[PDB]
Amino acid sequence: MLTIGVIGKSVHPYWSQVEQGVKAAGKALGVDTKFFVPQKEDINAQLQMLESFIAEGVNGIAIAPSDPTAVIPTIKKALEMGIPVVTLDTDSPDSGRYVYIGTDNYQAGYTAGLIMKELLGGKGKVVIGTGSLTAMNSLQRIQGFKDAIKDSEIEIVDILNDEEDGARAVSLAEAALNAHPDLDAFFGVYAYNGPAQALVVKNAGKVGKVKIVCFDTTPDILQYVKEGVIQATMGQRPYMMGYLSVTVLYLMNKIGVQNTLMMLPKVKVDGKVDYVIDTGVDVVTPENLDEYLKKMEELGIPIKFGSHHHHHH
Numbered sequence: 684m685l686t687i688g689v690i691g692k693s694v695h696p697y698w699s700q701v702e703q704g705v706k707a708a709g710k711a712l713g714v715d716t717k718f719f720v721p722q723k724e725d726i727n728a729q730l731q732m733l734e735s736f737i738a739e740g741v742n743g744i745a746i747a748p749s750d751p752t753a754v755i756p757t758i759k760k761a762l763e764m765g766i767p768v769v770t771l772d773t774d775s776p777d778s779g780r781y782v783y784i785g786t787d788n789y790q791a792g793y794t795a796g797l798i799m800k801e802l803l804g805g806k807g808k809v810v811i812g813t814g815s816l817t818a819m820n821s822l823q824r825i826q827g828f829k830d831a832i833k834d835s836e837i838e839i840v841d842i843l844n845d846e847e848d849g850a851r852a853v854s855l856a857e858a859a860l861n862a863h864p865d866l867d868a869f870f871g872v873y874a875y876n877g878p879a880q881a882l883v884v885k886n887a888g889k890v891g892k893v894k895i896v897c898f899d900t901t902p903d904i905l906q907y908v909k910e911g912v913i914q915a916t917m918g919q920r921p922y923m924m925g926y927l928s929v930t931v932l933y934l935m936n937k938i939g940v941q942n943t944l945m946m947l948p949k950v951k952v953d954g955k956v957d958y959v960i961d962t963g964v965d966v967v968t969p970e971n972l973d974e975y976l977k978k979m980e981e982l983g984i985p986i987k988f989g990s991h992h993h994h995h996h
């Protein structure tokens with residue numbers, strides 16, 4: 684059979700959720716799969732694995748580039764070798780990759796900022812925590828958030844980059860609350876940030892006093908949402924990113940690139956035709972959590988939190 688390789692950005696449970704989609708699609712379509720993440724943000728590790736996949740003669744590659752520019756030459760080389768390439772989770776739109784499969788990161792951040800604006804009444808101080816200052820998804824989320832709060836009196840008083848290191852996400856957030864005792868809110872951009880901010884807020888006895896709006900729906904985040912430490916999180920569909928990345932690359936092998944692209948959503952921004960699978964976003968709050976868990980279970984998306992139903996056939 685064919686082999687399809689997938690490269691993500693860090694060891695976080697988020698990437699395990701992606702990997703479970705990769706595995707599921709591998710079984711469903713009968714294709715071997717390979718998955719790699721470095722421990723934290725590490726463009727050279729990604730680049731090295733990319734080169735390995737090409738040298739192994741894989742039939743397709745999906746990559747979540749920590750730096751959109753740095754990966755362009757190696758993606759070009761894969762394409763020259765006849766290896767189709769797609770991105771997932773975060774993009775490199777000038778690379779030659781055929782499809783981006785992931786969240787509308789700009790719109791998700793914009794939604795987060797509208798939520799923050801309402802939560803704070805259009806006023807107060809926010810600290811941002813993120814794990815990249817180069818990955819487009821982070822840049823887009825932060826820009827969306829800023830654009831959405833622009834008209835209000837809200838001020839961003841720090842943007843802190845942990846480079847996808849959870850210990851560092853914790854220490855930076857802790858330092859921020861100590862530096863800013865009048866902090867009104869944290870915004871968490873990557874999966875590490877919400878729960879790190881939640882831990883710090885809870886440790887400081889500021890639950891509900893310092894609001895948290897964040898990203899993702901890993902079990903640690905969901906538990907803080909349940910407890911009311913996190914008021915809202917922008918849930919992605921990592922399982923679907925992994926699953927549909929394998930599916931697209933599989934099709935590009937079986938029916939070809941052109942035929943596959945004709946099946947997908949086509950977009951055209953600034954006159955440039957491109958192909959994008961929006962895996963969607965779910966705003967998750969304490970008030971809609973049970974409904975969220977219901978939604979994911981019925982969508983067939985595994986969530987290792989809360990109750991589960993089994994139908995006996």
Ligand SMILES: OC[C@H]1O[C@@H](O)[C@H](O)[C@@H](O)[C@@H]1O
Nearest residue numbers: 692695697814873874875898
């Ligand atoms: O930090 C863990 C992960 O957080 C997610 O929110 C992002 O989409 C990923 O790009 C990142 O690697």
